[PDB]
Amino acid sequence: VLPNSSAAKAGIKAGDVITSLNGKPISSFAALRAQVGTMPVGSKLTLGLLRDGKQVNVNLELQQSFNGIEGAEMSNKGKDQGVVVNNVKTGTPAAQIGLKKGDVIIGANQQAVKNIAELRKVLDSKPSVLALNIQRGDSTIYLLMQ
Amino acid sequence: ALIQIQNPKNLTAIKMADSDALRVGDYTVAIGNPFGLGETVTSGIVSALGRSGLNAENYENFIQTDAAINRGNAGGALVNLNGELIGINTAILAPDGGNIGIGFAIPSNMVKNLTSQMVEYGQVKRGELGIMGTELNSELAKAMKVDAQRGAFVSQ
Amino acid sequence: QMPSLAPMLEKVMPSVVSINVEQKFMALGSGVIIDADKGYVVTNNHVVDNATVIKVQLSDGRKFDAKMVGKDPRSDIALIQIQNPKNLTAIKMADSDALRVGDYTVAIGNPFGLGETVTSGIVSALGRSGLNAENYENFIQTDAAINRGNAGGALVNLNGELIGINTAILAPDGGNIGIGFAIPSNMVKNLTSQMVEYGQVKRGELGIMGTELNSELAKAMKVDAQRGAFVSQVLPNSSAAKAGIKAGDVITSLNGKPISSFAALRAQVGTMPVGSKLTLGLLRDGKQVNVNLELQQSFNGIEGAEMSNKGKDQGVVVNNVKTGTPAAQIGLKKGDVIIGANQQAVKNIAELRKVLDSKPSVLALNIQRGDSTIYLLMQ
Amino acid sequence: CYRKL
Amino acid sequence: CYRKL
Amino acid sequence: CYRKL
Amino acid sequence: CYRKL
Amino acid sequence: CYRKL
């Protein structure tokens, strides 16, 4: 089972064996693979488990596979103190441009940025290039995209 | 590079000019030794200035010229119609090893600065201002509300 | 005091642009701003053919986007239009018919995308052709350095006036050997002016066949000139036929300008707009001949059938149908009389064309052939 | 080869 | 046999 | 691409 | 033998 | 690429 997965949250452990789905027995894994792959996200269902000859039932809710723009999770800072960067994922298009966790955006594209609302109003303009006036530490730097 | 002739007797030096006044359209005269044939002179003009990218790690401010330049022209002189040194012929753009009218020369003002350090110290004292940056395109000037479409953009 | 070209070049170079174009491929070439206000930039068709996106980088680096306007692959000339034109610089055009072999030339282009690169040369020759026999080619030849990317670039004289458009080179290895070719400005003048006014090129013909004049055929036909255009035959109903050109004539001049070859003369009028009134210099039986001519194409007739109205709102009688036309593919023997079509009565070509303007997917004609009433179907 | 014009 | 640019 | 001399 | 969810 | 001055 994968971490932060609904099944992990549900209580599914390795060595389990799935026997039924919402009451209906399952014909094959490749069938079940096709079954839930067609249900819309969040489909609350019930499963039939088998670990060590004991029937277990669990209810589940599908999972995916503050703002977040192009592989970077963000949130607000203070009272119009910019947009503080909580953390960055490395191999994503966000940190492939040199972004590191902790940076705080004061402005962008010569337009003042006080919160995330003034940011997405710059994304509503869709500039060919975005020039960010962030501050990491005691420095005033710029970072670009696209 | 700079070399020293042993027993210098009866030599002729070249007057170097201010390459920072060069303009696209000036007539150029190339001097070198293609294929060891001997001192060969060819004519051309200033195709462009500030050319770079043949080797991005190198400090290249090449002058482009249609003066004929082949293998062996390297280290040769590029002079104006008065014979004052404007650049040192360096490389060509030849997919076949024969000249097609694209030579590159390093401006004399760069050569004048680089030779003067080798005379006193034997190496180059590499100095730094301490800034990062990249090229300014027309797209970036729109975002930064900048008028000029070319130059140096200060990252930090 | 040193001579230099920087006075002419710093004035002209802003008028020449560099092009980036995007089995998908990405290419680059060059163009020259012709009309500063409308942002018209002419370039080679083989640079902007099969182009989905057209981006222009000016001399200063400013980027623009351009859209197709006209194209003529037979002459390898195309026109694009900069969108949102802001503070552009047009180029002055010269008349190339005054160029002389030995004049100094200047080549501006974007070789290998390195940027706007300027190279020098002279007029090697004029009217050269032969690399692609089906193309209208009357090239200017120059020893000015021209390589991949100079295509669509500018060839100017010493005064910065546009004389030709760098198009092609002759190279056994893909690298310049001192042989470059450019389309004379006057041809581009005629070629571009049609793209602005018509969006395509209205191609005219005189209705004559022929072949070039060699020294050996001049012997057999007792003709003085060793070079020109030999009249093989005149097609009937051609402007040349109506003008009185007969076979066996030898063309020596066009509007006074002597002729270099048949192939070069072919490229000239291949760019002139339809109806262009011109004067030719002929040679039949060793006698000088001049003729005025008017190019031609190569009631209301609809889709290869000549038709007109009959009587007083009695329909659209078909006057004639040529066998093998889209209107002879669906019978329509000469003499048909259309009373109606698609349950609507046809009194005239106007009530017909008002139904043609509807552009229906299928057309049922209520014509009458002979004393009988039939139907015919289209599309 | 006869050309047209 | 012959090429362009 | 680019060559030396 | 490896295939997601 | 990031270049230094």
From Swiss-Prot, chain A:
Domain of life where this protein originates: Bacteria
Family per similarity comment: Belongs to the peptidase S1C family.
Signals that turn on the gene: By heat shock. Transcriptionally up-regulated by sigma-E factor and the Cpx two-component signal transduction pathway.
Task of the protein: DegP acts as a chaperone at low temperatures but switches to a peptidase (heat shock protein) at higher temperatures. Degrades transiently denatured and unfolded or misfolded proteins which accumulate in the periplasm following heat shock or other stress conditions. DegP is efficient with Val-Xaa and Ile-Xaa peptide bonds, suggesting a preference for beta-branched side chain amino acids. Only unfolded proteins devoid of disulfide bonds appear capable of being cleaved, thereby preventing non-specific proteolysis of folded proteins.
Effect of a null allele: Decreased induction of Cpx two-component regulatory system. Increased accumulation of periplasmic accessory protein CpxP, increased accumulation and toxicity of overexpressed, misfolded periplasmic proteins. Increased resistance to hydroxyurea, probably due to decreased degradation of misfolded proteins which eventually leads to decreased OH radical formation.
Protein name: Periplasmic serine endoprotease DegP
Assembly behavior: DegP can reversibly switch between different oligomeric forms that represent inactive (6-mer) and active (12- and 24-mer) protease states. Substrate binding triggers the conversion of the resting DegP trimer and hexamer into catalytically active 12- and 24-mers. The conversion of 6-mer (DegP6) into 12-mer (DegP12) or 24-mer (DegP24) is crucial in regulating protease activity.
Residue ranges constituting the PDZ domain according to the UniProt record: 59-138
Note: DegP is indispensable for bacterial survival at temperatures above 42 degrees Celsius, however is also able to digest its natural substrates in a reducing environment at temperatures as low as 20 degrees Celsius.
Compartment(s) of residence: Cell inner membrane
